[PDB]
Assembly symmetry: D2
Homo-oligomer: 454 residues x 4
């Protein structure tokens, strides 16, 4: 039925880091688990002495790499499961997400004509915010495997602090795998292009994309023709990210490294802060202010230029390009109107932020059949609009942030597969928001690559 | 002071391999835990679907590098804790053990003048054999954290199948960390050598090694002066190994690649002295998997039998797939080893000859601790080298037990550690280990042996 | 008026090499200079103790590289002046030829999707065969600056053996320069693509080629995006070749190196043997049999399958792929009929030869205005036909052999510049056959690159 | 026994630079040939359009590497024939001189623990100063193959402007060859070290250097063991240099790159002891060109004047653009050098301090030959190092005269060369050179100096 853990050290914080961290977690914190302090402390004590998912050296490396995005010289690709589950944390599914993301990154690398830094939603994306604490069945809402259970049973939905330790054990495990995969041949560039050629061959819309797939093949053969040294072509770096929601988890995964000493959050390389949680004097923003990881903020349609600037000033006080990513998620019918003024006010500060586009969360809607769904064409249209805004202003479309899987699910309408509302019942397997399946995520990759080319 | 942690099914292995496997595991198995079989089946069912600790392509890469050891063109360095514990599975401890190993590997690379394959006793070394069924305090013996608890307490010593899952969790976590470390510049050659130079400053015997340390420093500077793209100098490959002993664990971590069947709890495993029953389940398991394998050869070993191991575990003549590990004792290796090497080189197979200068040189001190004398250890390595020099075969590698902690479990070395001192920091959970300073010392002496 | 040289050693040949070389030069030799033996010996003695233009190590390297062409995995680009002159042996003109050739090689590399081994007609192409010893003015025919003078003066046309030493001094000098250029930044791949982009921008037919120039730009940016190591991109190897015509020069430039000892001809990396000189028991073919350099044979429209095979057997006796290049030069109206049977008979021997195409020398004709000229469209058409033959037979179009310059001469009709017979008078500067100028050689590069793509 | 060889115009240099240049060359010039000025103009007109021996980007690359010498992070090695001859401009001789130089550079790279910039006296070193106007046989002095002939014969000694063109022809030919050699694996580090090991076998003093040779071998093996992409180990950069003396030649080889004016007969040139008249044409020429430049500083040098050279030849404070070359004598370098270094480091400019331990240590032996004692040479390098050690400045490089021929022109070394022996192979055309074995010997001793 269960395995067991014993309960025990960490070195003392510089007094200022202690004071600022304490000051930060004192502030109110939205969407937290409602569970006993007695027990959360115990779990935290376990987590305070485990090996971290990531290490500082990798996080400052990611920081430099992201600095190049902010300056206009690279492109950010963030993707993966909306909600990871302990039950799907298997080699096939991890391998599938890494695969999908890599396939997209080849196309975006060739189309942006510049590097793509590749960030997975993985090894920690186990918690989610909800708008209601009672879902559409009278049950306490599901909030991710880190908090409670998906199964629609009263007792499954109780907030269980032991999931804090499970969440880490899965996280670590998955990360161990992706490291391995990416270092050992799965991320070989020729092997991924091969899968892309397969997609063109068997997709219905193969013709739509054969020309560009071929041009990539030839720019790739060109490398061998010029006798380049192929070592950089045999691996790729995938970085872990998740939404920093459960502050009991994040605080327990903090560690102290350097160039004076600083707090890194080693549950991941980079975290972001959601629409529901970005309260400006709230605890998530203050926590972000204390950690050295690159951080993202979701910006929704109620966002105002002046506010946005307040985020930039609190999170990027030292003008470190790449430290802060602002992620727009307006919806295709609104991004062209709402985003331009925000970008004007922010670029006018002298701060170099990464303008990332989330074309997913502003475009959900309820199918006639009862499924949370997103139509492919609206997703494409929001990325289109994003690009138009940035071209018109002379600013860098920094990247994109999508929800995808390597499984061939049926959760988003449209795309080359003409997935109908009737088809959604076949393999609707998400534990929260609907995902672009393997074919739709790759097709979106091609389309955005054409936007990049212009 | 305890809290509990609750717990899909994918394809099963192909029926024909499941059949061969069932047949192989029906052989009797030594040293297995006495826990119920339904519980055990359950935990195995869990592990059968978790993400592996290693992936196959890494293992075939290791087989290639080891193939170069067997052919005489590289050298194997295998080291780490005797018995990993869950409570000492922390970032500092893993960091220090990786550190110590890398530090040895630098010196042995300069001295061997050939690559060193770096293998760590780590991520999975949670089970041990035991001779007695009742230990000195009248309790069930401690069999390793995979099986029971170290605490001298009736309940801690009960055999608990859930410790399988716990072990897996500690194994991947730790593995994850070494993967990150070796990729983020803890294995930057320049940095590791820096630590070695601090050691020459600090060590009571720093003068006996200033020469070789300086010579290494100048070969490194030499690489920089020749302007030689130092990317390969920024990272190292460290492989995971442990004694494959608990066949419930090892069998549940089997996974399928033509297609071969791999064990993805480690890159390589070995069969210990007490489990290599030629007709037992451990050797059979070693026959089925594709992982490299090692076998401990003790003083009771005969040439005739070693040949049986070659015929069994290297059927298709793959160089480096089998390592034979001498652990005789320094007063015995010179007599007992040469005949075995003779008989086995005769057969045509290319094996790795690896020296374990530790597990046959342990004695009990009047301070009450079980310990090992540094000089006896060094001397088994000296004898190992003298054997192979005499016979024209390749001295393949070492296989030592070490730590990065400044610990006090082995007598001697430059710190001249007394039996009085043993009580200071005797932190081991099983055998005594060379501490950080002693392991580096040994690396310098073995370095002189290779020149 | 003149500089002076003193007359002097070499080590003795293995007796078998001596015997075979003696046996070879005893055979009759066509198109030789008619000048005193007394003096030719003297010049030879000077040349027997000079530093060579090339060294053996480079020639066996070229041999391996050409082996890859024969096996179908690379492509051969040979080009340069028809006839070098001592008077045009200046840094600007050498730099111009290297430049032109490099520009072509970028395009052909990208279009073949495989390496291009780059061979210049340079540092030795100072002698030529003639069909008549009296030209159209009653003067002894001009035979290249190695033999006599271009100037139409009786005394200029006397065969002067001192030109053997001049020829070397210029050769060495030019080679010194190209080495330098190619090693020091002229052959940087980005710097050459830049010139190509300039061509597209200012050419009249820019539109014809903008798409492919852009695709090359993007496959080139792709390399940096993937973080390749750029050292191989900063230089390129250019090899010297010329027609081995004056056997007094070639024999004096022989040296003995290794893997038993062999005779290398170090006046160049590779030599070829012309239509006028390929007599099968003649001295040129026998000389080729003795040297270790890769060798080419010109094959004209009177060529027969069986003969061709005799060349292959004499020149490639050890079946060393890449050792022998057969160079077709039929003319566009004839290549499709004459070449296929030859290729059938030769491939049927088990020998792997490089099928190189010379679309120049079969397409000369006399303008209405009196200029030796070649029409661009016929040149293109012969390369087209060459490719068609090889596709139809499943054999490798190995390369091409053109006559080009970096100067903006007017010597070939047609191309994007619509160069008319009236325009030929402007800058007709060749010392023998008409050359594709810079723009026409690059346009031809694009067209052949499209044939390679198919 | 002679045969004769007969002989476009492109843009001229920009008028404003032609103006500055004419103004600079109107200064008086020492040691120039006494040949007619119309003939000379003609030959210059020829050279003004020929292909250069070097190209500018190579020169600015050299300026970068030398900038690293001046800053203390690299070391300069300059060596080759004293006086190149047309008749010894052969593949074997160039091959042997490049060989000898590379062989020294390997040892000095291991010993310096920093890159060595490798500069050869080659492709252009065809003119020499002379003290006497009438030599010992009562003939016009031999001024170098660029000017007249070595043969003791009234006619050979006439100053012949066509030897300009001849020299150019020999300079590019030779240059071509070194370019090919260094690019085709005569500069493959593994091969060059091989020759060094043959030397330790062969040399009468092979035992004094077996230690350092072995240590180098093991650092090389070390690079291979760390698996370090050895492309940069397959080739070397060798630069051409000569004493810029015949201003007709050097001026005709000027060529225009913002745009700078370069001298493309060599990568770098120097002004000798007899031509550095501060207000003369040689220093002026050095002011105008962008090439690196060196100046010989003799025993009559004063600190005050050296400063004038710095102010003149390094106006825009470019580190490494100017090298100052000490040639005092071993009994003099310790006294005479320190004040100069003092005065010049004072000025703020970063120069290269280079030791010429040869041109101030030459004496006539009773066998009649002019020669140099090996120990005196070594000792001027020792004193040079001791000076710079004392003052905290960087000992920048050496500047020796050597050959790859097994020649007998300098006394001493491991072969203990007697004055009896000098007559054996005294093949030089001017100063006596260290032979192949002696130059390598010197490299090992200087290597010990750098440690
Ligand atoms: N290492 C480079 C190139 C590369 C290797 N594998 C890849 C897979 C996908 C995209 C790019 C790559 C990068 O990550 O950009
Ligand atoms: N190219 C490097 C290393 C090197 C290659 N070949 C060499 C020969 C000698 C000395 C050094 C080298 C250098 O010039 O330093
Ligand atoms: N060195 C490679 C790539 C290259 C460098 N410079 C070039 C110039 C033109 C064409 C290719 C190249 C080659 O020669 O193929
Ligand atoms: N990567 C090489 C060299 C190397 C890098 N870091 C190291 C640390 C220790 C020893 C060797 C290395 C190896 O594993 O051999
Ligand atoms: N985990 C601690 C913070 C901490 C981090 C690192 C330390 O070294 C010490 C303390 C907390 O949440 O309060
Ligand atoms: N040059 C000589 C041939 C030769 C070549 C190399 C030698 O080493 C000797 C002789 C000839 O033409 O007859
Ligand atoms: N994912 C399964 C098995 C597992 C256990 C521990 C770590 C990783 C995976 C679970 O959480 O129960
Ligand atoms: N090492 C501790 C904490 C831990 C829990 C789970 C996985 C990894 C580590 C234990 O085993 O109890
Ligand atoms: N090309 C000129 C000048 C020159 C001389 C010698 C070598 C190279 C070029 C000539 O032949 O007269
Ligand atoms: N070195 C010989 C031959 C030679 C001629 C021309 C150029 C180069 C070399 C000479 O100067 O006479
Ligand atoms: Cl604290
Ligand atoms: Cl006990
Ligand atoms: Cl001969
Ligand atoms: Cl004299
Ligand atoms: Mn979501
Ligand atoms: Mn043990
Ligand atoms: Mn022609
Ligand atoms: Mn001299």
């Amino acid at each position: 039925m269960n395995w067991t853990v014993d309960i025990p050290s960490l070195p003392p914080l510089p007094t200022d880091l202690r004071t600022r961290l304490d000051a930060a977690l004192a502030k109110p914190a939205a969407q937290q688990p409602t569970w006993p302090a007695d027990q959360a402390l115990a779990m935290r004590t376990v987590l305070e002495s485990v090996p971290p998912v990531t290490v500082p050296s990798e996080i400052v490396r990611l920081q430099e790499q992201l600095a190049q995005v902010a300056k206009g010289e690279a492109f950010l690709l963030q993707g993966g499961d909306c909600a990871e589950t302990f039950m799907d944390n298997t080699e096939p599914h991890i391998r599938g997400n890494v695969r999908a993301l890599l396939q997209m990154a080849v196309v975006l690398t060739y189309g942006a004509s510049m590097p793509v830094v590749k960030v997975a939603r993985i090894a920690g994306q186990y918690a989610k915010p909800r708008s209601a604490d009672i879902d559409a069945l009278g049950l306490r809402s599901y909030r991710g495997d880190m908090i409670n259970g998906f199964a629609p049973d009263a007792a499954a939905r109780e907030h269980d602090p032991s999931r804090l330790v499970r969440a880490y054990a899965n996280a670590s495990a998955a990360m161990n795998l992706v490291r391995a995969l990416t270092s050992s041949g799965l991320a070989s560039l020729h092997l991924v292009h091969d899968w892309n050629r397969e997609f063109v061959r068997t997709s219905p819309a193969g013709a739509r994309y054969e020309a560009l797939a071929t041009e990539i093949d030839r720019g790739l053969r060109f490398m061998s023709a010029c006798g380049v040294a192929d070592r950089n072509l045999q691996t790729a770096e995938i970085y872990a990210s998740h939404e920093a929601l459960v502050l009991d988890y994040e605080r327990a995964m903090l560690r102290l490294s350097d160039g004076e000493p600083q707090l890194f959050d080693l549950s991941a390389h980079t975290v972001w802060i959601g629409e529901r949680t970005r309260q400006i004097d709230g605890a998530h923003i203050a926590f972000a202010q204390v950690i050295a990881n690159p951080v993202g903020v979701k910006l929704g349609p109620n966002m105002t230029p002046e506010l946005a600037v307040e985020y930039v000033e609190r999170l990027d006080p030292h003008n470190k390009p790449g430290r802060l990513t602002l992620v727009s998620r307006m919806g295709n019918h609104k991004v062209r109107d709402l985003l331009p003024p925000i970008v004007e006010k922010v670029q006018a500060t002298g701060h170099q932020v990464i303008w990332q586009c989330d074309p997913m969360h502003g475009n959900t809607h309820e199918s006639s059949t009862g499924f949370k769904t997103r139509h492919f064409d609206r997703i494409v249209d929001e990325v289109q609009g994003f690009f138009e805004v940035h071209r018109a202003l002379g600013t860098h479309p920094g990247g994109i942030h999508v929800e995808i899987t390597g499984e061939n699910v049926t959760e988003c309408l449209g795309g080359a597969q003409d997935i109908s509302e009737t088809d959604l019942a076949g393999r609707y397997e998400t534990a929260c928001d609907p995902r672009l399946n393997t074919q739709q995520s790759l097709e979106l990759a091609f389309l955005v690559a054409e936007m990049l080319r212009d």
